[PDB]
Symmetry: D2
Subunit: 255 residues, 4 copies
């Protein structure tokens, strides 16, 4: 009932954090459009959840995004909230191992895809006095080792959130972001499998938080529903969902 009658688009909603956000909004009473470039997860989610439908869309293709917005309006008549969750973390890479072309490609997904959907949705969000929620990362704020391009893209997302909150405030459209820490998702599982010692890498990821565990997609989802439905005086904020990983001293050097 908390967000009943509202219409929500979630990008990258087929698995992981995105799927947790989809479930949270459905459980809140909203109708949800699942955007994803992969069919398998999103199509099953649509079969599972009444009130969720899947639309195939690669957020780096402007025509895909144009079609995503116009199909949402044609099928549901309004748009109240856009959750820009689609993104990717490459394998760990030393700075000298990165390239400018890989950096550009990551900017297309993590940053320009967020920019494009937000721009095309804003005319409808103004009509509904809706809101924008970007999924950024704690490492945009504190940095990360072996991830120069990834960290740069999330620093941009968090900053862009504040700029757009300023521009859209006169229209009553709020723009906020969530900065998760280590959340246990298929990407976390995939990247750990490439590590020399997968079990050790997962152990270290759980101990990076004072709480002693990683986060869950449903916990990012609850934060998103809060920002959409009950945070009417919040705009341009960065909501940390990190288990306290940024607090206090810890071992940062190995020698």
């Amino acid at each position: 009932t908390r967000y009943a009658g509202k219409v929500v688009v979630v990008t990258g909603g087929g698995r992981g954090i995105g799927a947790g956000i989809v479930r949270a909004f459905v459980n809140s009473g909203a109708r949800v459009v699942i955007c994803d470039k992969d069919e398998s997860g999103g199509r099953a989610l649509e079969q599972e959840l009444p009130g969720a439908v899947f639309i195939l869309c690669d957020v780096t293709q402007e025509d895909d995004v144009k079609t995503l917005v116009s199909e949402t309006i044609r099928r549901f008549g309004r748009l109240d909230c856009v959750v820009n969750n689609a993104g990717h973390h490459p394998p760990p890479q030393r700075p000298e191992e990165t390239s400018a072309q890989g950096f550009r490609q990551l900017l297309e997904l993590n940053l320009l895809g967020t920019y494009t959907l937000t721009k095309l949705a804003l005319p409808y969000l103004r009509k509904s006095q809706g809101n924008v929620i970007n999924i950024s990362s704690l490492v945009g704020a504190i940095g990360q080792a072996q991830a120069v391009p990834y960290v740069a893209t999330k620093g941009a997302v968090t900053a862009m959130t504040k700029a757009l909150a300023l521009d859209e405030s006169p229209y009553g459209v709020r723009v906020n972001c969530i900065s998760p820490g280590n959340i246990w998702t298929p990407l976390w599982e995939e990247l750990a499998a490439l590590m020399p010692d997968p079990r050790a890498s997962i152990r270290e990821g759980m101990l990076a938080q004072p709480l002693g565990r990683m986060g869950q997609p449903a916990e990012v989802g609850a934060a998103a529903v809060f920002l959409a439905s009950e945070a009417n005086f919040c705009t341009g904020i960065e909501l940390l969902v990190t288990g306290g990983a940024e607090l206090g001293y810890g071992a940062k050097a190995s020698r």
Copy 2:
């Protein structure tokens, strides 16, 4: 239903932000103990709200706080959440107009009262895996003019929140704070009446936010219920409820 079966203590809950927090938790299904040093507002609130009871308590008197905790346990059998909201903003004061004794007295209310209740409640919060919510202020983070002692007390509250989150994480007790901006409350009304031009001071307070209005106590209350009931991976965070006042450039000099 979101916080049903839980028991919550709110200090300074008789009016203003505190009363908005009380109402939010009652509406969530919790039983609420209203702490306040003044009887008038809190006693009426208890008559109004089933599930809220008023206990007279000055948070700067350690024996008052000891009695507040033991009465809560005797009457309700558990304690799940402590909201440290009691505090005060003195009239604007130039630095040379402040005194060390006024500074100490403000520290007793805004900082040591929060410390004392939290310490006495933590044995019961550990049993329930409960949580602590401190009401700090945006001006602890960005400063404020003519308010050296006030700003110092809120900088301490925000920092203390993070230290205690680290100590209590091994026990599953989360410690978070909310940093409101300009919220329209009886204190805001009282301080504006002392100004040379009350209507001008209220106009300026509304324009300090890109959203063009002040916040409401119910909006701080919704943030508190989120932190208590649905933010299980959030500890040591500072949740801004400010209407965007910290964003972008604005006129800060007068000459």
Copy 3:
């Protein structure tokens, strides 16, 4: 004498903040390579300053940057510090007036040009235990109105600074950034001339700081010399040179 015997590259050093940084390092005893895509300012600066030489280089062209580094080594035998100052602020633009292609182009200058020079210089900086200084902006941290692409590029620069500081710490190479506020430069003068009321826009820019004035290029230059020569325990920091613009409340809404 503070940085005698050292070799410094400053991008965009032909005018504005960049030229102030060049002068500061020359006055500290360093030899300075002035990089710029425009010949007029940088060539005169080389004639004016013993110990500074001008190399024509567009930082968005990878071959230009490759040649800049190899010419620096061929002519001076070492490289101790890279100051990534080249960048641009477009005229104010509403979000719906921006384009993805303009956003990409601004990313090439403000972000990828910084990335490219840093990458090509790091082998020589490791030999000298040198350091990197990026010129970011306060608006990366607090946002700005009518500047979504600009703000995003500076959020990325600040975040990238921290990521690279982590990767290069094992080699003793420090990576820091400076975040200036309103600095009076030819770009500030040019953008103000496009405003409906140039004199009013300059007045407002001076009042945005509690200090009541804009900053000067020489003040950014002194901060850069500090980071290069005397901040041996500073890495991944963001040094604010803003006149206090981020402090306290100010008028942010117009209605």
Copy 4:
């Protein structure tokens, strides 16, 4: 020569960080008044350094501080900079092991002593357009385990710095703070000796920084001289001198 003709007061200047700051200002050309409550270190420093003199003063005693200011003026004719460095870190203490009276006493030293000297010096700093430098701590910003009162006092110092910067900006008096991380000092040595395994505790303190070492008092001193002599557009800033300890993920839980 950088700060020649200027007069500087440094509290707690007899050993540790304070003594490093004293040496840095003497080497810059300034005359320095060493304030300390202990005679041994400060008296030897006065014998060692031409241009430094020792004045016995406990910053928690208001009459001591009154005498410190009037003796500085009587002997040197002006006052340009006050460095509030005097402070203390108690042994690690669980929250339930702390007391309100110990908390109050620590507030007297770390916070109210800074407030008192600053207030009494400001009339002379306005005449000279001088500046204030408070020595805070990184743990005011990120928290620390087993240090609730200490962390609270430093959160207050950092916030107070910004409030006072706002009040004093119309008079051209700048107010800044330095937030050091782990600096190797006699207090660090003393606290490590109380640990179950002193050598292990020192090893862990060095590895808490990506740079792999602790900081030195002379490095805090260089930051202070920068803020006094060359940071004319810097007010209300928090200058981190931490070796990057706040950057990236590290092990924060033990189980």
